[PDB]
Design a protein around this ligand. Sequence first.
Ligand SMILES: [Mn+2]
Ligand SMILES: [Mn+2]
Ligand SMILES: [Mn+2]
Length: 692
Amino acid sequence: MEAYITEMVSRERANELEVYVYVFPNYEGVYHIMRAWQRANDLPLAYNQHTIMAFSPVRHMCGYTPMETQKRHINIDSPFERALLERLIKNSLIFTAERHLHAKRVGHALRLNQVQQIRQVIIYEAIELYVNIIENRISIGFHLTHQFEYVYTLQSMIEQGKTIRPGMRVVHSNGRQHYTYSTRVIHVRTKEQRLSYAATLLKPLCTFETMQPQDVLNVSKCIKLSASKRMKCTYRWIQQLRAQYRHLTFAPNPFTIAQNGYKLDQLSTPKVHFHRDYATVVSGMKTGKLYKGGNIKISVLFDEDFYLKHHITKKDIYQFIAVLQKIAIAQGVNMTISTSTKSITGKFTDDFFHHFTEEVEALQPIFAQTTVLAFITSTHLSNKKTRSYQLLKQYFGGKWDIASQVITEKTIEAFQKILHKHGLKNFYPNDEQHCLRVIDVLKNESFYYTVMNILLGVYVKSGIQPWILANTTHSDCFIGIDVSHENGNSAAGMMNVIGSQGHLIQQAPLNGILAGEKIDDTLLANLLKQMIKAYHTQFQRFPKHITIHRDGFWREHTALVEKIMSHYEITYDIVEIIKKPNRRMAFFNSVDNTFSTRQGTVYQRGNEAFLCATNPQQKVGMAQPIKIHQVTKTLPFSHIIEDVYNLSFLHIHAMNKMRLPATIHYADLSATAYQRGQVMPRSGNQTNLPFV
DNA sequence: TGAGGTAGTAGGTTGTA
DNA sequence: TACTACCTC
DNA sequence: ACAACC
Ligand SMILES: [Mn+2]
Ligand SMILES: [Mn+2]
Ligand SMILES: [Mn+2]
């Protein structure tokens, strides 16, 4: 089974290419000159600032006189010339595709051909091409995708009855770029600026939000392809394009990693520690005790809409809570229902949810020092007049710092449907020999994952660590850093993982609200110092090595990190982790002519790597790789990749496996929760994951 | 909002000898 | 970044 | 204005 990558490398070196350079006397530069020359000459071109490069001499110059004309090679030491050559190569490839393959440069990709006609919806195939220069080598990477469009214009709505709403979403496509806003006049508006059209070019926007039902079910099946179909469709078109290109030459089979310079490494799943060593997380959860148990006080918030709008009684809620309790304690966690929620009977009605802002602040002393189990209906959580979820989370997190887990009516409806199927409606509150039977019949259903995710959320919101890593890692400390953007505001998500096995997963007790996307020196210094102090408190000794995991590209001051770290004589490393690298990985089996994917596979070339961390099903899609980049030199790169892979098995908030490591996956949530004002700092030395 | 996966859509900011 | 849809456990 | 992440 060969290992394939969605890239190729040329035989010609970067400096072995003969090009023409034109130099003319603001980054717009000579864009108009480019446009004039290419409309008059029918040639692939490119510019950069004030310099134009082409593969062939330009004859019709439209009365333009450059300063210097040269026919030379590229200078590798100049990034400017490398960028210009990459642009020229990309333009040449697009030119060849457009002429010889009937491809349209629509949006950011190349529209190729329509594959499905799903009841007045067209799905096209599109491809994205990327050209890079990696140490005198020219690499071309590509990525297949899809596009949506309706076959009917607003003129069709003008005729054949029915009208158009004033706030309707319409897109006008000129071929290269599209704007989103009887031959009647139209008044579309992309912004405060007003615009008008002929109502015969504008078409409705095709998005999953605006699609009618019984169409999303079919358009989704055509974009979620198997690995084999996706890779074969990519490679067939790439070979067809290569059959026409002449500027570069490639091997007959350039899609293997051997022809690209990558190395193959296979990683193995770790072991987790509940009370002994377990092969998998789910087995330990099913038949094991937690790593660090304790006591939880739980309070119940119940709304009357479960009874007025549905056939759900408070006794059903308390029997569900009793079942949840019986599932616990068997794992070593003791939960007790607080009795303080007894003088507010019937307080949560529709008027309460309509006047939440004014009726709140009388509920602090009854829900204090507990974890709230919220049983609000979906409509009240989602309705724009009420917005129960936003207000609940905002108040309870950013005002009183009380954890809360929300359960809607669909979960209880499914639980009662399971009970109906098994025909078991005995009293599950204060009556044993029935909760045990309910638990036994639950283990054979898929609702076990739901109830266990609910319990794990409650646990990590209360301060219980369910499991750790059985084996040690190559680094002591870990830090995850992320920044979120909403409405011109920014917030930073920062996490602490203390210990080699992840003995303590926690967030930094720092204020994440920042002005302008700039993590200042004071914040970074405070984060590093608090990480060191927390590790020293936990282990009575200073750490040896600290790893920094960054989401996206590292833009912070790298000199401050070394200045802080050399003071304490502690080594460090900085790693950039890129989700969505726009590449794909697969194994080709020539016996069956099929592509497959194996979790834990590493492609490494230099200080950059690709990692496979998921095993999605055939109808879910294809695994997305992760790009890992090392900025420092302290540790071997293989150890860093191993740490990144092993740290993603610490998804202590859910049974289902996540793709990214714990640091970044939780820093993202922390930043998002700080953006919406749903969390406030808390000082302590226990597990704290209020966002979950 | 039980949780996670993957795959479409539209905008926003960084940095560029 | 943000949103939406589906499937899986 | 192109490019890469958001
Ligand atoms: Mn980010
Ligand atoms: Mn994020
Ligand atoms: Mn949650």
